[PDB]
Paper text:
In bacteria, RNAP relies on dissociable sigma factors (σ) to recognize specific promoters and are thus the primary transcription factors. In contrast, σ54 recognizes conserved promoter sequences at −24 and −12 (13–16) and forms stable RPcs that are then fully dependent on specialized activator proteins for transcription. The activation of RPc requires activators that bind to DNA remotely upstream (−100 to −150 bp) of RPc and use adenosine triphosphate (ATP) hydrolysis to remodel RPc. σ54 controls a diverse range of stress response genes, forms a major variant sigma class of its own, and has wide importance for various bacteria. In this study, using both fully duplexed DNA and −12/−11 mismatch DNA, we formed transcription complexes, using the AAA+ domain of phage shock protein F (PspF1–275), an exemplar bEBP shown to be active in vitro without its cognate DNA binding domain, ATP hydrolysis transition state analog ADP.AlFx, the RNAP, σ54, and a native fully duplexed nifH promoter DNA between −35 and +28.
Structural models were obtained on the basis of RPc1 and RPc2 reconstructions, while the reconstructions from RPi were insufficient to build detailed models. The structures are similar except in their relative orientations to RNAP and the degrees of distortions of DNA around −11, suggesting the existence of a range of conformations in RPc with varying DNA orientations. Notably, promoter DNA consensus sequences interact extensively with σ54, via ELH-HTH and the RpoN domain as well as RI. The flipped-out base of T−12 of the T-strand is stabilized by interactions with S335 of σ54 RIII-ELH. In the RPc structure, we could observe density for σ54 RI-H1 (residues 15 to 28) with P17 N-capping the RI-H1, causing a sharp turn away from RNAP and into the DNA double helix. M15 was observed near the −11 melted base. This raises the possibility that σ54 RI N-terminal peptide (residues 1 to 14), although unable to be resolved, probably due to flexibility, could have threaded through the DNA to the opposite side of the DNA from RNAP. Here, we show in σ54-dependent transcription that the nucleation of transcription bubble occurs in RPc, due to the interactions between DNA and σ54, although activator binding further promotes/stabilizes the −12/−11 DNA distortion. This DNA melting nucleation event involves base flipping and subsequent capture by σ54 residues (tip of RI-H1) at −12 position. Unlike the σ70-dependent RPc that converts to RPo readily, the initial −12/−11 DNA opening and the following RPc engagement with the activator in the σ54 system are insufficient for RPo formation.
Residue numbers in the entry:
A (entry chain D): 755 to 804
B (entry chain D): 253 to 704
C (entry chain D): 52 to 101
D (entry chain M): 108 to 229
E (entry chain C): 1 to 1341
C-alpha cells in the first residue's frame, strides 16, 4: 500500500492503520498456526529415514 | 458396545459379519434346491461384494451403516491410517502415572531439583509406600497399608519423604521436537497443586508458564534410575546437541539484572576512592558507596591456569566498578577478571559460561550458572528494573520529517498527474521516499534515545 | 446361541470354571468336555485367542 | 470411537481376592492351594463346596486336610474379613476374633456363637 | 442532565470528543427479529410458515379429483412457563393447530363439489418458541443456534490462476450454484475447451446441453457466431469489408477497394489506414483464393438439383470440394470471423470431438452420465434431464438468487421464476466466452456482496418444508387408495415426520450448541457469532489460505479483531455494533448523508455493493458546528483505498468509532495502544472469565458496559413500574402509577430473583436488589444485578493495585505475584455448582424403592439421611458419603434352612437388597443447597415429595393472594366511599364490615342495588381466585414424564467455594496470560511512603516486546481515579459541608475537555449528592471510547488534580530490608480477570486402575483414571539418550503384559526391583487381527 502507518502506539493509531495491520496480524497468526503441521511432517520423514 | 441400556447392536464390526453369514446361508439354501442360473449368479455377486466390503471397505461401494452416513471400519481400516492399530501399538502406549500437572516457576530450587506436590507424590509412589510400611513393620498386611494410606496418617508423610528422597523423576513438556524435551530431576515436597520448574531449564523446554501443563514419569527399576541420573539430568545437558553452545543461558530477568549491576553514570557516589576487592560488598549495603562508580581501584587476585598442571596466583591493581567486583566475588578462581568487564551483555554471559565449562569442568560451571541466576534474580528485583510511559522518548524532528515526506509525495503525484511520470514509477518512487523517511525517523529516534 | 457369533465351543470359552450348561464346574474338571455342554474349563482369558 | 465402545475392566470381589494373594508371601505349593480356594468363592461370600472337597479335588492324596486349613485360615482374614466362610457361622467367629478384646461382652458373645446359635434361631 | 435514577447513583465520566448521533441498538435483533417473522402471522404469503404451507399447498390425487385446502393456522399457549421447563426438564414449545378443507370433486362432472370437510382442525407438531433473550429451553437446557455465512446462490466467474495447470494458464470458468437442486460448472481446458461439469461428476463433451435443448448445429453457428458477408459472381470472390467488425489483421496481398487502394498490401496495418478506409465508402472487394481454406462454413447447404450429402456443416473448406460447390447452386455460404487476436471461437473445436450429434444420442449421454447401467427406453433419459433442474419440483432456488443472477448479466428485470430457460445458459456461456476473450473482470469469492448469511429462521423454514413434504407424499399416496369415503382428514395427516425433523434440527445440530453462562458478555457474543462450518459453504477448517482471511469489505460488517485463537481462525466472525441484515440476506452498515459539504442527521444503511460506488469519509475527522469541514483535504475511501479528497466529492461519513469493532473488543480500554494480535487474543480471553462473590465496577471503561449488561438479559430490568412497596432477597413488588396501567388490573408487578441456580458451565448465578425501600423506578431501569454485574454496569473482574517490577523472580515471563491481603478479603473467590442424579432403573426382578435402610453400613453414614433416603439441606459432604439410599432387590430363594437361619436371626435382610446407593466419586468437600425429585404418574411413593410441593404451592399462593388482597382493599374502599352521607357512622364500618349491613336503611332507592352489585363483584372475585388457585395447584403437581425403564429420578445439587491459589490463570484485558506462583505475605510485599502495600506484581519485561502501552495507560488512569476516590473519602470522613463536596465533584467532572456538559445542583435536590458520592468513594469510574480515548495530557492533569505525581512513578520501600528503591517504579490499579483454568481440575495422578478390553491399555480422560498420550516425539527423545531399559519398562510393564506389570508391582512391594520383557498384548491383538485375512504369520524359533 502506498500510504504507510505514521502513528506509534504511544500517540494512538487511527482506524485505517489498525484495519490494515489487522490483515498482517491475521496472516502472521495463520502462518504460525499452519507451519506446525509441515514441521511435524518433516520431522516424521527425517526420523523415519534415519 | 453397550451404548445406552440394552444396546447390543454390535455395529461397525459385526454387521458385515452377520450380513456375510446370512448371504452365505441364503446362497447355500438356493444351491441346495437347484435354483436358476441368473439368481445364483446374482447371489454369488452380492456375496462377493459383501466379502470385499468386509475385508476392506471404502474401495468399492462404500457400504455405510443404517444408523447414519458414518462409514464403518473394516478389518483393514483399523490397521492403516492415523486411527490404525500401528499408531497405538507402535509408540502409542499410555503410561500409568503420566504426570499431567500445571507447571510453574520457582526461584529457590536447584538445577537438579524439581518441586512436586505432596498429594501427587502420594498416589504415584503408592507401591513404594506399601513396601516401606511392610518393611518398617508399621503395616502388618497390605490391607493395613492401604487403610493407612487412605486415611493419610502422620507417619505416612514422613515415610514418603524418606522414600522419595533419592528417587529421580523425569518431567517433559507435551510438545517436544528435540532431545532436551525429556529431562530428569529430584522431587521436592512442596504444598499446592503445581509442579515447580527450574528457571534456567525453561529455554530447553520452550515454556513461558502462560498456562501450559507438564508430564511426569517415575522410573521403577534400578537401571532406569541410573539412566535418568547419568544421562537424563539437567546437569548433564548444559550444552545443546545441535550446536554445542550452552543452552542453560539465563533468562531476561537475570541478564537485565547483571547488566544494570555493572554500570556507571558519570561520577556517582563512591567514585575515585581506592579500596580492597570482595570488601566492596560492605559499602553497597551500608550505603557508603553506590554499585555504579567509575575510576574505582580494587585489589583483585587472579588464579590463572597458564602453567601446565597447576594454577598460579597474580595480584595487581585494576580499574573497575563496585558491581563488577561483587560479581567477581562469586566468579570462580579459574576464570580471568577481563571477562566481567564488558558490561556483561547477553552474548557475554553465554561466552563466559562456555569458557567456564571448557576450562574448569561441568560441576564448576553448573554452580556458577546457579549463582548467576541467584544474583540476577536478586539484583534485577532490587536495583533498577522498571518500566513507564515516560521512558518512550519521541523525536522532535519526526513531525518535520513526516511533513517533508508528505510534500515529496505531493510533488511526485503532481508530476504523475502532469503526464511526465507513469503509474509504475509514481508508485516505486513513493515507496522509496517513504522507506527513506522511515529510515530517517528511526535514525533521529536512536539519536535522541540512545546514549543521549 | 448355538453355532453363531460369541457361541460356545467356538470363539473361546465361558466363565473360567463354570459351563454354560451348569455341570462340571468348581475347578473339579480341568480339561474334560461334557456331553451336555461342549464348553472347555480353561481360563476366560484364552477367549481372545481362539 | 473405534471397535471397543470405551472398554473398561471392572475389578470385582474375586479379582480383589486374587490381588491380595500375590502381595502376600506363600510358597509355590501354598499358592496353588489358595488359587483353588478362591475359585470356590461365590457372590455371596462363602466357600461353595467344602473343606475336604478341595482336598479331594486336588487329586493328590499327600496333601493333608490341615494343609488347606492352614491356608484357608489366613485367606479368610483378607479384605472383607469373613470372606470364604464355612457354612454361615464361621463368619461370626472370624469377624469377632478380629477387633480387640476390650469390647464389653466379647466373652459372652463368643460363648453364644460357639454352641448356642440353634437357641438364638428361635 | 441525565435525568436518570439508576445512573445518578454513580455517574461515569466520559472523554468522547465526538458526539453520538445514533443510539446503541438492541444488540440482539439478528436473533430476535429473524425468528419473529418465521412465527408471526403474515397477510401475504411472502415468508414464514405461510411460505412453507403455500409451497406444498396443491395436493391432488392421481386422477382422483381430490384436493386438500387450508384457511390459516394458529398457535396455542404453552403448557409450561419458561422457568417450569428448566425445573422439570421438558422443552418449551407451542402446538401447531391448523384448519384444513377437504373438498372432493364428483367424478364424471366438470368441477362438481358435493360436500366439504372443513370443520375440524389438525395438530401438526410442537414448534419451539424462543425466549425474550434469544435462547431456547430445549430439553431443559439453554441452547443457541449460530447463523451460517455461505456463498449466496447465483453465478460466479472464478479466475483459477496459478499452478492449477503448471504452465501459466488462466482457465476462466463459470459456476452456478442454486439454493436447491443440482449444480452446474463450465470449467475450461488448456486446449481451449469449455468442458461442462454437473455436480463435480465426470467430464462432458461440452455441447451435450446444447444438443439436448433442441438446438441444432446451424442454430448454434448462427447464435454464438456471426456471418459477416459472402458473395460470388462469375468467380470474382468479392466480399464486403467492415473496419469495425474486423481489424488489426495483416493482409498478404490483393487489397484494393474499388480502384484506389487505401491499405497498401504487404505493409503492417495501422490505425490511419483503418480510419481512411472507414471514411470512404466500402464495397465488395476481391480476395485471393488462399483465404478460402482458412474460413469455416457455418450452415450446411445442398444442391437444388441433387440432394447429395456434400457441404457438411462446421467443416474447413476444401479445394476439390470448392470447384463443385461453385456449381452446386449456392452462391452465399456463411463463414466465421476466426480472428484469434480478439475473438476466440472455442466452440467449433469442441463440436468435432463429440461422437454424437443427434438430439436422442445427446440426451442419452446425460442419463448414462448419472446412471452406469439401465439404458433409457426413450422415457427415462428425458425425464431425468427434465426433472434435474427444469421441473421446479426441486429447483426452487431462493428467488433472491434469481435477482443476483439477473444482476450479473445486466438484466433490468429482477423478478422472475425459479426455473430458468435456455436463454439463461446461453447468456452465461456468452459471458464466459467474453471473459475468456477479455471483458470486465472476474468475481471475488471473499467479497461480502457475493455471500449471504442464513439465520435461524431460514434454517427452521427449510427444515419445516423438508418435514412437511414427507406428509404431502403421504397424504397423496393415501388419497389414491379408498377415495370413496366420508371420513375426517385426521387419518391422512400425520405429524410424526414433522415432529421428528424439528426435533432433530433443534435438539442436536452442528450449528446449535450449549451457550456459556459465565460473564454474560460471552452470552452476547455467542448470540452474535457467525460460523462457516456445517451444511454448505466450507467443509473443514483447512479449506483454504485466502478464504479465512480478513477482507477490506470487513470494515463495518463483521469484526476482524475478534476471532478464535484455535486452528479455526478466520471462519468464526462477530457482528459489529451497528451491523444489520438486508431483506435479501446480505449485511448492511449505517452512514451519515453528506450533501454540498454539510452533514445531515439522517442515516442510511448501505450494503457491501452500494458502499463501493460512493465516497465514504472517516469518523475521526474535524467538523464545524454548522456541519462544514474544517480542512479542505479530508481522508476518505473512494474504491477500497483511503486517499485525500475535497469536501465536495465526499458523500457519506461514518457513524462512530465503535462501528469497526464488535462488543467483544470494544470494551478493551485504549485498543489503539495495543498490538493487533494481542488485543485479538485478549478479546477472546475476555469471554473465558468467571464471576466472584462481590462484583466491582471497573474504574476505567468504555461506557458500553451498561448497554451490555442491559441487553444481556441476565439482570432484572423494570417494565411499566412505579413506586416500589416491598423488596426481598428473592421477591420484589412494584406498584405502577395510575396513569400507566390499563383499567381492569390491580396495578402491581412482581419480580422473582434467581437464587443459586446451576449453570451450563458448572458455575453459580445470583441476583440481589439494588433498591432499599420507597424508591421510584422509571421504565427501562434495572432492578437487580446478576452475576458479574454492579449497578447495571458489567463488572467481570476486580480492581487491584498492580506494579511492574521483579521480586526475587516470582514474576517470571507469564507469572503474577499475589499478596496475602487478596486471600483475606476473599477476592476472586468463586462458587461452583454441580449436580448428581440417580434413577430407580426398574428391572425384571421387581421394582426398586428408596427406604434408607440399607445393610452393610452403620448409623454413622445414615445419620445425615432423612426418613426417605436423601440428606438434609445444609449438611456437609466430604469424600464418598451416602446421599440417596437406593436398593436393588434380588431373586427369591428356596426354603434353605441353612440360609433361613441367618434370614431369621438378623431381621429382614436375607440377601434381598443390595447397597446400590448414590456413592459420589472420590474426595470432594462441599455442601448441599437444594434437591430435586421426579416421579411418573400413577405412583404414590411420595414419602417426602410433598415438602417441595407445599413449598412451591405457598410460594405461588403468596403472589397470587397479594393481588387478591389489593383488589379486596380496593373494593372495601369503594364500599366505604359509596356509603358516605347515607346515615352510617364511622364506628360501624371500622369494627366489622358485615356486608354494609346489607344496605338496610342507607338510601332504600339505590343503596340496595349498589350493595347487590358489590356482592356480585365480590362473589365473582372469589370464584376467580378459587379457579386460579385450583389451576395453579393442578399445574404444580401435574406430573413429569420420565424414561420407561426408570421409575423415579432424584437429583441433588452441591455448591463448593473455590479461592485463589498458586496455579490460577489471572489475566487482564490486554493479553497478560499470567499464572500464580506464590502468595507473598503482607509485610513482605513492598509499600509506599504511606504504608499501603501493593496486591498484584507483574513482569516489566512484557511491555517492550508485547506492545501493550494501553494497559499502562489504564493503570495510570486507575491510579488517578483512586487518588480522586481517596480525596473524596477523606472529605467524607472529615465531615465537610455539602457545598465543598459538590464543588469538588463538579470541578473533577467538568475539566479535561469539551466532551459534554454536566453540572450539579440542576437536578439533584441536595440529598442525591450524598448518596451519589457515597458510591464512588472507593474509586471514580471513567469512560473512554474505542478510538477516541483520553490523551496523556488529560491523564497528567487528572493526576495533578488528585494530588498525584505527573509521571506516575513514586518511591517505594522493600518489605524485607526497608530500603528505598532507586529508579522509582510506576504504581497504580488495574482491572484483573479470573479465568476458568484453575488447578483444581487440571491436576491428575494415578498409579494403577482399570484397563481396556482391547490390548489392555488404560484410558485417556480424567474420570475413571487414565494415562496421557505418550506420543512418538517422547520415545524418539529417549532413543537419543540411549535409555533402552527405561523405554522397555515404559512400554512393557506399564500398559501391556498383564502378568509383567503384576510381577513389577509385586517386586516393587517386596523391594526386589526386577522386571521382565514378556510380550505386549497389543502385538498379539495385531497378530490376531492380521490372521483374520488371507495372511499367514507365525512365531518360529
Amino acid at each position: 500500500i502506498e500510504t504507510p502507518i505514521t502513528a506509534n502506539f504511544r500517540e494512538g493509531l487511527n482506524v485505517l492503520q489498525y484495519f490494515i495491520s489487522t490483515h498482517g496480524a491475521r496472516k502472521g497468526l495463520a502462518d504460525t498456526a499452519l507451519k506446525t503441521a509441515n514441521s511435524g511432517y518433516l520431522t516424521r520423514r527425517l526420523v523415519d529415514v534415519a | 458396545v453397550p451404548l445406552d441400556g440394552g444396546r447390543f447392536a454390535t455395529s461397525d464390526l459385526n454387521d458385515l459379519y452377520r450380513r456375510v453369514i446370512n448371504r452365505n446361508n441364503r446362497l447355500k439354501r438356493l444351491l441346495d434346491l437347484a435354483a436358476p442360473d441368473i439368481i445364483v449368479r446374482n447371489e454369488k455377486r452380492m456375496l462377493q461384494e459383501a466379502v470385499d466390503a468386509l475385508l476392506d471397505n471404502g474401495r468399492r461401494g462404500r457400504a455405510i451403516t443404517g444408523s447414519n452416513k458414518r462409514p464403518l471400519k473394516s478389518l483393514a481400516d483399523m490397521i492403516k491410517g492415523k486411527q490404525g492399530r500401528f499408531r497405538q501399538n507402535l509408540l502409542g502406549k499410555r503410561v500409568d502415572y503420566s504426570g499431567r500437572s500445571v507447571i510453574t516457576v520457582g526461584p529457590y530450587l536447584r538445577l537438579h531439583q524439581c518441586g512436586l506436590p505432596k498429594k501427587m507424590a502420594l498416589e504415584l509412589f503408592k507401591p513404594f509406600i506399601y513396601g516401606k510400611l511392610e518393611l518398617r513393620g508399621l503395616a502388618t498386611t497390605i490391607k493395613a497399608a492401604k487403610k493407612m494410606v487412605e486415611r493419610e496418617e502422620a507417619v505416612v508423610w514422613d515415610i514418603l519423604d524418606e522414600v522419595i528422597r533419592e528417587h529421580p523423576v523425569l518431567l517433559n513438556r507435551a510438545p517436544t521436537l528435540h532431545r532436551l524435551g525429556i529431562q530428569a530431576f529430584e522431587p521436592v515436597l512442596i504444598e499446592g497443586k503445581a509442579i515447580q520448574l527450574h528457571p534456567l531449564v525453561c529455554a530447553a523446554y520452550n515454556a513461558d508458564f502462560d498456562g501450559d501443563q507438564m508430564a511426569v514419569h517415575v522410573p521403577l527399576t534400578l537401571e532406569a534410575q541410573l539412566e535418568a541420573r547419568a544421562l537424563m539430568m539437567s546437569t548433564n545437558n548444559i550444552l545443546s546437541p545441535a550446536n554445542g553452545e550452552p543452552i542453560i543461558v539465563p533468562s531476561q530477568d537475570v541478564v537485565l539484572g547483571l547488566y544494570y549491576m555493572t554500570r556507571d553514570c558519570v561520577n556517582a557516589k563512591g567514585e575515585g576512592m581506592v579500596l580492597t576487592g570482595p570488601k566492596e560488598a560492605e559499602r553497597l549495603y551500608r550505603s557508603g558507596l553506590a554499585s555504579l562508580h567509575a575510576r574505582v581501584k580494587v585489589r583483585i587476585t587472579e588464579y590463572e591456569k597458564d602453567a601446565n598442571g597447576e594454577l598460579v596466583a597474580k595480584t595487581s591493581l585494576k580499574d573497575t566498578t563496585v558491581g563488577r567486583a561483587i560479581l567477581w566475588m562469586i566468579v570462580p578462581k579459574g576464570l580471568p577478571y577481563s571477562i566481567v568487564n564488558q558490561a556483561l551483555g547477553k552474548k557475554a554471559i553465554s561466552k563466559m559460561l562456555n569458557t567456564c565449562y571448557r576450562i574448569l569442568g561441568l560441576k564448576p560451571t553448573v554452580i556458577f550458572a546457579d549463582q548467576i541466576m541467584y544474583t540476577g534474580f536478586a539484583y534485577a528485583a532490587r536495583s533498577g528494573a522498571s518500566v513507564g510511559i515516560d521512558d518512550m522518548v519521541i523525536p522532535e524532528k519526526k513531525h518535520e520529517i513526516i511533513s517533508e515526506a508528505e510534500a515529496e509525495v505531493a510533488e511526485i503525484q503532481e508530476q504523475f498527474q502532469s503526464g511526465l511520470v507513469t503509474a509504475g514509477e509514481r508508485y516505486n518512487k513513493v515507496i522509496d521516499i517513504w522507506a527513506a523517511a522511515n529510515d530517517r525517523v528511526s535514525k533521529a529516534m536512536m539519536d535522541n534515545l540512545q546514549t543521549e | 446361541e448355538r453355532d453363531g457369533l460369541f457361541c460356545a465351543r467356538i470363539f473361546g470359552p465361558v466363565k473360567d470354571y463354570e459351563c454354560l450348561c451348569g455341570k462340571y464346574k468348581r475347578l473339579k474338571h480341568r480339561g474334560v468336555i461334557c456331553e451336555k455342554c461342549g464348553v472347555e474349563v480353561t481360563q476366560t482369558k484364552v477367549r481372545r485367542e481362539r | 470411537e473405534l471397535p471397543v465402545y470405551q472398554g473398561e475392566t471392572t475389578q470385582t470381589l474375586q479379582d480383589y481376592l486374587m490381588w491380595q494373594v500375590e502381595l502376600t508371601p506363600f510358597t509355590d505349593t501354598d499358592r496353588a492351594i489358595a488359587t483353588s480356594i478362591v475359585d470356590a468363592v461365590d457372590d455371596t461370600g462363602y466357600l461353595t463346596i467344602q473343606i475336604e472337597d478341595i482336598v479331594d479335588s486336588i487329586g493328590d492324596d499327600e496333601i493333608g486336610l490341615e494343609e488347606v486349613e492352614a491356608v484357608l485360615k489366613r485367606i479368610q482374614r483378607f479384605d472383607p474379613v469373613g470372606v470364604a466362610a464355612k457354612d454361615l457361622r464361621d463368619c461370626l467367629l472370624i469377624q469377632l476374633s478380629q477387633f480387640a478384646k476390650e469390647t464389653p461382652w466379647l466373652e459372652e458373645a463368643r460363648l453364644i456363637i460357639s454352641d448356642h446359635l440353634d437357641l438364638l434361631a428361635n | 442532565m441525565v435525568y436518570s435514577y439508576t445512573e445518578k447513583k454513580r455517574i461515569r465520566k466520559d472523554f468522547g470528543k465526538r458526539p453520538q448521533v445514533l443510539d446503541v441498538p438492541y444488540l440482539l435483533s439478528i436473533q430476535l427479529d429473524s425468528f419473529q417473522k418465521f412465527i408471526e402471522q403474515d397477510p401475504e404469503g411472502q415468508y414464514g410458515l405461510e411460505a412453507a404451507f403455500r409451497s406444498v399447498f396443491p395436493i391432488q390425487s392421481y386422477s382422483g379429483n381430490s384436493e386438500l385446502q387450508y384457511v390459516s393456522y394458529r398457535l396455542g399457549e404453552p403448557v409450561f412457563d419458561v422457568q417450569e421447563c428448566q425445573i422439570r426438564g421438558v422443552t418449551y414449545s407451542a402446538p401447531l393447530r391448523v384448519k384444513l378443507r377437504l373438498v372432493i370433486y364428483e367424478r364424471e362432472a366438470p368441477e362438481g363439489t358435493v360436500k366439504d370437510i372443513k370443520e375440524q382442525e389438525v395438530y401438526m407438531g410442537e414448534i419451539p418458541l424462543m425466549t425474550d433473550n434469544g435462547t431456547f429451553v430445549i430439553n431443559g437446557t439453554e441452547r443457541v443456534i449460530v447463523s451460517q455465512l455461505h456463498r449466496s446462490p447465483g453465478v460466479f466467474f472464478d479466475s483459477d490462476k496459478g499452478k492449477t495447470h503448471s504452465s501459466g494458464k488462466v482457465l476462466y470458468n463459470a459456476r452456478i450454484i442454486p439454493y436447491r437442486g443440482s449444480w452446474l460448472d463450465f470449467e475450461f481446458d488448456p486446449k481451449d475447451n469449455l468442458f461442462v461439469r454437473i455436480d463435480r461428476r465426470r467430464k462432458l463433451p461440452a455441447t451435450i446441453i446444447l444438443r439436448a435443448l433442441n438446438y441444432t448445429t446451424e442454430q448454434i453457428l448462427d447464435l454464438f457466431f456471426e456471418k459477416v458477408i459472402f458473395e460470388i459472381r462469375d468467380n470474382k470472390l468479392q466480399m464486403e469489408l467492415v473496419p469495425e467488425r474486423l481489424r488489426g489483421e495483416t493482409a498478404s496481398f490483393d487489397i484494393e477497394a474499388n480502384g484506389k487502394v487505401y491499405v497498401e498490401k504487404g505493409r503492417r496495418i495501422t490505425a490511419r489506414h483503418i480510419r481512411q478506409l472507414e471514411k470512404d465508402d466500402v464495397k465488395l472487394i476481391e480476395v485471393p483464393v488462399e483465404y478460402i481454406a482458412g474460413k469455416v462454413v457455418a450452415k450446411d447447404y445442398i444442391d437444388e438439383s441433387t440432394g447429395e450429402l456434400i457441404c457438411a456443416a462446421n467443416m474447413e473448406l476444401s479445394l476439390d470440394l470448392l470447384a463443385k460447390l461453385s456449381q452446386s447452386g449456392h452462391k452465399r455460404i456463411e463463414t466465421l470471423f476466426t480472428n484469434d487476436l480478439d475473438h476466440g471461437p472455442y466452440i467449433s473445436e469442441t463440436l468435432r470431438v463429440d461422437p454424437t450429434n443427434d438430439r436422442l444420442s445427446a440426451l442419452v449421454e446425460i442419463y448414462r452420465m448419472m446412471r452406469p447401467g439401465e439404458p433409457p427406453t426413450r422415457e427415462a433419459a428425458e425425464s431425468l434431464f427434465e426433472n434435474l433442474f427444469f421441473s421446479e419440483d426441486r429447483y426452487d432456488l431462493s428467488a433472491v438468487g434469481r435477482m443476483k443472477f439477473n444482476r450479473s448479466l445486466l438484466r433490468e428485470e429482477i423478478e422472475g421464476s425459479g426455473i430458468l430457460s435456455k436463454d439463461d445458459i446461453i447468456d452465461v456461456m456468452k459471458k464466459l466466452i467474453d471473459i475468456r476473450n477479455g471483458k470486465g473482470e472476474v468475481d471475488d469469492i471473499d467479497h461480502l456482496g457475493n455471500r449471504r448469511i442464513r439465520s435461524v429462521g431460514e434454517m427452521a423454514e427449510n427444515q419445516f418444508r423438508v418435514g412437511l413434504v414427507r406428509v404431502e407424499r403421504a397424504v397423496k399416496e393415501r388419497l389414491s387408495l379408498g377415495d370413496l369415503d366420508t371420513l375426517m382428514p385426521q387419518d391422512m395427516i400425520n405429524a410424526k415426520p414433522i415432529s421428528a425433523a424439528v426435533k432433530e434440527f433443534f435438539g442436536s445440530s452442528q450449528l446449535s450448541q450449549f451457550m456459556d453462562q459465565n460473564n454474560p458478555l460471552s452470552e452476547i457474543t455467542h448470540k452474535r457469532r457467525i460460523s462457516a462450518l456445517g451444511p454448505g459453504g466450507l467443509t473443514r477448517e483447512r479449506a483454504g489460505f485466502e478464504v479465512r482471511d480478513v477482507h477490506p469489505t470487513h470494515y463495518g460488517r463483521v469484526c476482524p479483531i475478534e476471532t478464535p485463537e484455535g486452528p479455526n481462525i478466520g471462519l468464526i466472525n462477530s457482528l459489529s455494533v451497528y451491523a444489520q441484515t438486508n431483506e435479501y440476506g446480505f449485511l448492511e452498515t449505517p452512514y451519515r448523508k453528506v450533501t454540498d459539504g454539510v452533514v445531515t442527521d439522517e442515516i442510511h444503511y448501505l450494503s457491501a455493493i452500494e458502499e463501493g460506488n460512493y465516497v465514504i469519509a472517516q469518523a475521526n475527522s474535524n467538523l464545524d458546528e454548522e456541519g462544514h469541514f474544517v480542512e479542505d483535504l479530508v481522508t476518505c475511501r473512494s474504491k477500497g483505498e483511503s486517499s485525500l479528497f475535497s469536501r465536495d466529492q465526499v458523500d457519506y461519513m461514518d457513524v462512530s468509532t465503535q462501528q469497526v469493532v464488535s462488543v467483544g473488543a470494544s470494551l478493551i480500554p485504549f485498543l489503539e495502544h495495543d498490538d493487533a494480535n494481542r488485543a485479538l487474543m485478549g478479546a477472546n480471553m475476555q469471554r473465558q472469565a468467571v464471576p466472584t462473590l462481590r462484583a466491582d465496577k471497573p474504574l476505567v471503561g468504555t461506557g458500553m458496559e451498561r448497554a451490555v449488561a442491559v441487553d444481556s438479559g441476565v439482570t432484572a430490568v423494570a417494565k411499566r413500574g412505579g413506586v416500589v412497596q416491598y423488596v426481598d432477597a428473592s421477591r420484589i413488588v412494584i406498584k405502577v402509577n395510575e396513569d400507566e396501567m390499563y383499567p381492569g388490573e390491580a396495578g402491581i408487578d412482581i419480580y422473582n430473583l434467581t437464587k443459586y441456580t446451576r449453570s451450563n458451565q458448572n458455575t453459580c448465578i445470583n441476583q440481589m436488589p439494588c433498591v432499599s425501600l420507597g424508591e421510584p423506578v422509571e421504565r427501562g431501569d434495572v432492578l437487580a444485578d446478576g452475576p458479574s454485574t454492579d449497578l447495571g454496569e458489567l463488572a467481570l473482574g476486580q480492581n487491584m493495585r498492580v506494579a511492574f517490577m521483579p521480586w526475587n523472580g516470582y514474576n517470571f515471563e507469564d507469572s503474577i505475584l499475589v499478596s496475602e491481603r487478596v486471600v483475606q478479603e476473599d477476592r476472586f473467590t468463586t462458587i461452583h455448582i454441580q449436580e448428581l442424579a440417580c434413577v430407580s432403573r426398574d428391572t425384571k426382578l421387581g421394582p426398586e424403592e428408596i427406604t434408607a435402610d440399607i445393610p452393610n453400613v452403620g448409623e454413622a453414614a445414615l445419620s445425615k439421611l432423612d426418613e426417605s433416603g436423601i440428606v438434609y439441606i445444609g449438611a456437609e459432604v466430604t469424600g464418598g458419603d451416602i446421599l440417596v439410599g437406593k436398593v436393588t432387590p434380588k431373586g427369591e430363594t428356596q426354603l434353605t434352612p441353612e440360609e433361613k437361619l441367618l434370614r431369621a436371626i438378623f431381621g429382614e435382610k436375607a440377601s434381598d437388597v443390595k447397597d446400590s446407593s448414590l456413592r459420589v466419586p472420590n474426595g470432594v468437600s462441599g455442601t448441599v443447597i437444594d434437591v430435586q425429585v421426579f416421579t411418573r404418574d400413577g405412583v404414590e411413593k411420595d414419602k417426602r415429595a410433598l415438602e417441595i410441593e407445599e413449598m412451591q404451592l405457598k410460594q405461588a399462593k403468596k403472589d397470587l393472594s397479594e393481588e387478591l388482597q389489593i383488589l379486596e382493599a380496593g373494593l372495601f374502599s369503594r364500599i366505604r366511599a359509596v356509603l358516605v352521607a347515607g346515615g352510617v357512622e364511622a364506628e360501624k364500618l371500622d369494627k366489622l364490615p358485615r356486608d354494609r349491613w346489607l344496605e338496610l336503611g342507607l338510601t332504600d332507592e339505590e343503596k340496595q342495588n349498589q350493595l347487590e352489585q358489590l356482592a356480585e363483584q365480590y362473589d365473582e372475585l372469589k370464584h376467580e381466585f378459587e379457579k386460579k388457585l385450583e389451576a395453579k395447584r393442578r399445574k404444580i403437581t401435574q406430573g413429569d414424564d420420565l424414561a420407561p425403564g426408570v421409575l423415579k429420578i432424584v437429583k441433588v445439587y452441591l455448591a463448593v467455594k473455590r479461592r485463589i491459589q498458586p496455579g490460577d490463570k489471572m489475566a487482564g484485558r490486554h493479553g497478560n496470560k499470567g499464572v500464580i506462583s506464590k502468595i507473598n505475605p503482607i509485610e513482605d510485599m513492598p509499600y509506599d511512603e504511606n504504608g499501603t502495600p501493593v496486591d498484584i506484581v507483574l513482569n516489566p519485561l512484557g511491555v517492550p516486546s508485547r506492545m501493550n502501552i494501553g494497559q499502562i495507560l489504564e493503570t495510570h488512569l486507575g491510579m488517578a481515579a483512586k487518588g480522586i476516590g481517596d480525596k473524596i473519602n477523606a472529605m467524607l470522613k472529615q465531615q465537610q459541608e455539602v457545598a465543598k463536596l459538590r464543588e469538588f465533584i463538579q470541578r473533577a467532572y467538568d475539566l479535561g475537555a469539551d466532551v459534554r456538559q454536566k453540572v450539579d445542583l440542576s437536578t439533584f435536590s441536595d440529598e442525591e449528592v450524598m448518596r451519589l458520592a457515597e458510591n464512588l468513594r472507593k474509586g471514580m469510574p471513567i469512560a473512554t471510547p474505542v478510538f477516541d480515548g483520553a490523551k496523556e495530557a488529560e491523564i497528567k492533569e487528572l493526576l495533578k488534580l488528585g494530588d498525584l505525581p505527573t509521571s506516575g512513578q513514586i518511591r517505594l520501600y522493600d518489605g524485607r530490608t526497608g530500603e528505598q528503591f532507586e529508579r522509582p517504579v510506576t504504581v497504580g490499579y488495574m482491572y484483573m480477570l479470573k479465568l476458568n483454568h484453575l488447578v483444581d481440575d487440571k491436576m491428575h495422578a494415578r498409579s494403577t486402575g482399570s484397563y481396556s478390553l482391547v490390548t489392555q491399555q488404560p484410558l485417556g480422560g480424567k474420570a475413571q483414571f487414565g494415562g496421557q498420550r505418550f506420543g512418538e516425539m517422547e520415545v524418539w527423545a529417549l532413543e537419543a539418550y540411549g535409555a533402552a531399559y527405561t523405554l522397555q519398562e515404559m512400554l512393557t510393564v506399564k500398559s501391556d503384559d498383564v502378568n509383567g506389570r503384576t510381577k513389577m508391582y509385586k517386586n516393587i512391594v517386596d523391594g526386589n526391583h526386577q522386571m521382565e520383557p514378556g510380550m505386549p498384548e497389543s502385538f498379539n491383538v495385531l497378530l490376531k487381527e492380521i490372521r483374520s485375512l488371507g495372511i499367514n504369520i507365525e512365531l518360529e524359533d
